[PDB]
């Protein structure tokens, strides 16, 4: 399956040209980019691995693509995403997040069901990739 986290995962995978234009948008709005890797595609995996610090002082879009490219050359098979962070009062949060890289084959998830009281079900979403292998060799 296609992991549909990120905000452009219903379009086809973004070319580098398209990525740069979203990075450009983000930066013209004054926002700070970073790059993150995981190979635990769980919906509740909040903290993907930081590819260095966020690029706070950076003015040129090309610098962020250069880092995305270096993440791609150095990270193991998995997901990478770019996020735009807005440190303005009353935001102080991420405001854009899209997937820049995904594995060729994502097996996805199954729904694990434990009987609670009465008819209630204790659900757990389980990852095929993550249960089979540890971090760094799941795809």
């Amino acid at each position: 399956m296609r992991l549909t986290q990120g905000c452009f995962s219903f379009l086809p995978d973004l070319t580098d040209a398209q990525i740069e234009k979203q990075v450009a948008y983000a930066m013209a709005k004054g926002w700070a980019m970073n790059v993150e890797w995981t190979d635990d595609p769980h919906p509740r995996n909040n903290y993907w691995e930081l590819w260095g610090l966020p690029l706070f002082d950076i003015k040129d879009p090309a610098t962020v693509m250069f880092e995305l490219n270096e993440a791609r050359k150095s990270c193991a098979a998995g997901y990478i995403r770019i996020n735009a962070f807005d440190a303005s009062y009353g935001v102080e949060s991420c405001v854009m997040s899209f997937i820049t890289n995904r594995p060729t084959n994502e097996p996805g998830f199954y729904l694990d069901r434990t009987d609670g009281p009465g008819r209630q079900i204790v659900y757990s979403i389980k990852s095929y990739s993550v249960q089979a292998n540890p971090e760094g060799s799941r795809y």
Binding site: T4, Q22, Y25
Partner: protein, 482 residues
């Protein structure tokens, strides 16, 4: 002769008898507003022959300390401090008999943390007053000191997106249809499909509570199965606004506790439950890590007309104070009343950290929001993916676009309905960010047609509802154009 006669008050102000409200301490053009005052803007239509300043002195009087005749018990209190002062009366543009009345109320007149107490003073009686043929509450300046007594949103826009892990587009949703009739099992079917096909949320309809055709527990359990199935199938956080609206506060809580027990990320409530049930469930939502969706049922009974009632922008402020996370605030281009610039003003009220006088949007007062969280506006009601360019233009980024008929009415099924909406949404935003002039009548629809060549569900949708608009003369209009 008797003690009563000898001790009668003989002063001008406190002899017994009626005197006009403008002589009673309720009018002062020279009055300097304090940072701590509560301010109201009233649109007053005096009865013929009633003095416009006397109409505003009356409203001010009867919304604070006054009654119809003079009372000596005023002198047992610090009466000069507790009186409201009407402090400015402007004519409405194009009315020789409708006026804008600004009235300042002292901070200490209001119970801390209490919408009910605020509204008792402010809307309690003055709208039934015979001296006035019409009265609309247009705006309020809730001072920073009163705001800090309120929670504000339980969750808020920032934390909401953090819980969903969803940033950069608007959020998506749909109302389940038909409105009523569906069994709990079939409700879960619609929710699964809607979420699997791409929607972030679905919702129970506002009138779906607990009924002979479907009792609420069946809905909740079958919907959680649908929700988790959709989340497992996509790797996204998913949810459906479980309606916990009930007759009693005891039944609401019961439904809300059950929703939490089974892992629902969100619940919904209807505005008809009323302010005190709303403040309680908004505290309950902060304390139980729940998103609180407010459907605005009954709002347009007092909010639709220009001449009388409460403007919706005021309800937005009061609902953000109380602490709901979502509130429906219009579409512009859908089936429900929504003048473009009024809606923008509403959205600004719900989403900004402070407000600046902006008369075209109906923002009559400047107002700090005291770091109360931001309320997510919801755009529901007769909208389709065909109008995505318009929605993105008028509504911005932080908003839930909801597509009931525009998902479930799709011929190829509900999944296809959903997928069409999301491709539309995503392709459009991608193009906004690229710098394209998307709100152009030529350009926007072509962005959706381009996206539609690799998405057959979206070409189906564009062709099915191409013709559909709801162009009718709006009644809740602005007084200052453009």
């Amino acid at each position: 002769q008797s003690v009563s006669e000898r001790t009668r008050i003989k002063s001008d102000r406190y002899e017994s008898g009626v005197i006009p409200y403008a002589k009673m301490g309720y009018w002062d053009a020279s009055y300097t507003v304090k940072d701590t005052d509560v301010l109201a803007l009233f649109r007053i239509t005096p009865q013929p022959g009633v003095d416009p300043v006397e109409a505003a002195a009356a409203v001010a009087g009867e919304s604070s300390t006054a009654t119809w005749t003079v009372v000596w018990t005023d002198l047992l209190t610090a009466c000069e401090r507790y009186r409201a002062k009407a402090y400015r009366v402007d004519p409405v543009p194009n009315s020789a008999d409708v006026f804008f009345a600004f009235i300042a109320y002292e901070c200490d007149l209001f119970e801390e943390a209490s919408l009910a107490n605020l509204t008792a003073s402010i809307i309690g009686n003055v709208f039934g007053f015979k001296a006035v043929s019409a009265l609309r509450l247009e705006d309020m300046r809730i001072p920073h000191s009163y705001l800090x007594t309120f929670q504000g949103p339980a969750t808020g826009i920032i934390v909401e997106r953090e819980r969903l892990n969803k940033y950069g587009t608007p959020l998506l949703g749909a109302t389940v249809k038909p409105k009523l009739g569906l069994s709990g099992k079939n409700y879960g079917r619609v929710v699964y499909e809607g979420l699997k096909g791409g929607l972030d949320f679905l919702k129970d309809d506002e009138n779906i509570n607990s009924q002979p055709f479907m009792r609420w527990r069946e809905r909740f359990l079958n919907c959680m199965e649908g929700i988790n199935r959709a989340s497992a199938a996509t790797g996204e956080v998913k949810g459906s606004y479980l309606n916990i609206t009930a007759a009693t506060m005891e039944e609401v809580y019961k439904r809300a506790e059950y929703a939490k027990a089974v892992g629902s990320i969100v619940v919904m409530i209807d505005l008809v439950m009323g302010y005190t049930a709303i403040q309680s469930i908004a505290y309950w939502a902060r304390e139980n890590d729940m998103l609180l969706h407010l459907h605005r049922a009954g709002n347009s009974t007092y909010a639709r007309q220009k001449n009388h009632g409460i403007n919706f922008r005021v309800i937005c402020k009061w609902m953000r104070m109380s602490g709901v996370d979502h509130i429906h605030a219009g579409t512009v281009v859908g089936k429900l009343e929504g003048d473009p610039l009024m809606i923008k003003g509403f959205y600004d009220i719900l989403r900004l950290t402070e407000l600046e006088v902006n008369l075209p949007f109906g923002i009559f007062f400047e107002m700090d929001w005291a770091s109360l969280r931001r309320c997510m506006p919801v755009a529901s009601g007769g909208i389709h993916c065909g109008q995505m360019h318009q929605l993105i233009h008028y509504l911005g980024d932080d908003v839930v676009l909801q597509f009931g008929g525009g998902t479930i009415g799709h011929p190829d099924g509900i999944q296809a309905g959903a997928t069409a909406n999301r491709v539309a949404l995503e392709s459009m935003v991608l193009a906004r960010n690229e710098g394209v002039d998307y709100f152009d009548q030529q350009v926007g629809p072509q962005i959706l047609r381009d996206a539609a060549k690799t998405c057959g569900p979206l070409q189906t949708a564009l062709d099915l509802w191409k013709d559909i608009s709801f162009d009718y003369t709006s009644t809740d209009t602005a007084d200052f154009a453009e």
